[PDB]
Design a protein around this ligand. Structure first.
Ligand SMILES: [Mg+2]
Length: 120
C-alpha cells in the first residue's frame, strides 16, 4: 500500500516562494518538487512540471508565486490505497507525485519512482 512506499521525509517550501526558487532547488539540489507550507501547515505541492508550464507560457518565474500554481485536491491519496490505485491516480491526473493525507493532514509524498522501484 501507499504507506509502505511513501516518503515521510518531505521537502518543503514557503507559500511566498516563487517558481524561480523551485527551479533553483531543482538545478542546485535535484529537488523535483516541494510541499508548500503556510504558517507551519502543509497545503499543497509545487513541481518542476509547474516550472515547465511557466516557461512554455513565457512567464517571469520570479513573479509566479507557488500558491498560484500549487495543487492539492486532485493529487492527494490515502496511505490505505494500494500501489496500483496510486499508479491509477497518477495516470488519470498525469502527475508523477501524490500527496499522502491522513487525518486531514499531509503526511508524506509518493512518487512514480517509488512505485517503479517497488515493482522491480
Ligand atoms: Mg498541474
Amino acid at each position: 500500500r501507499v504507506e509502505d512506499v511513501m516518503v515521510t521525509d518531505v521537502d518543503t517550501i514557503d507559500i511566498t516562494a516563487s517558481l524561480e526558487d523551485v527551479l533553483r532547488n531543482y538545478v542546485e539540489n535535484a529537488k523535483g518538487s516541494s510541499v508548500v507550507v503556510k504558517e507551519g501547515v502543509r497545503v499543497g505541492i509545487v513541481t518542476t512540471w509547474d516550472v515547465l508550464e511557466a516557461i512554455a507560457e513565457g512567464d517571469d518565474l520570479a513573479e509566479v508565486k507557488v500558491w498560484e500554481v500549487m495543487e492539492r485536491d486532485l493529487v492527494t491519496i490515502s496511505p490505505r490505497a494500494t500501489i496500483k490505485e496510486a499508479a491509477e491516480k497518477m495516470v488519470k491526473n498525469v502527475v508523477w507525485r501524490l500527496l499522502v493525507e491522513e487525518d486531514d493532514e499531509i503526511i508524506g509524498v509518493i512518487s512514480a519512482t517509488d512505485i517503479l522501484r517497488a515493482k522491480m
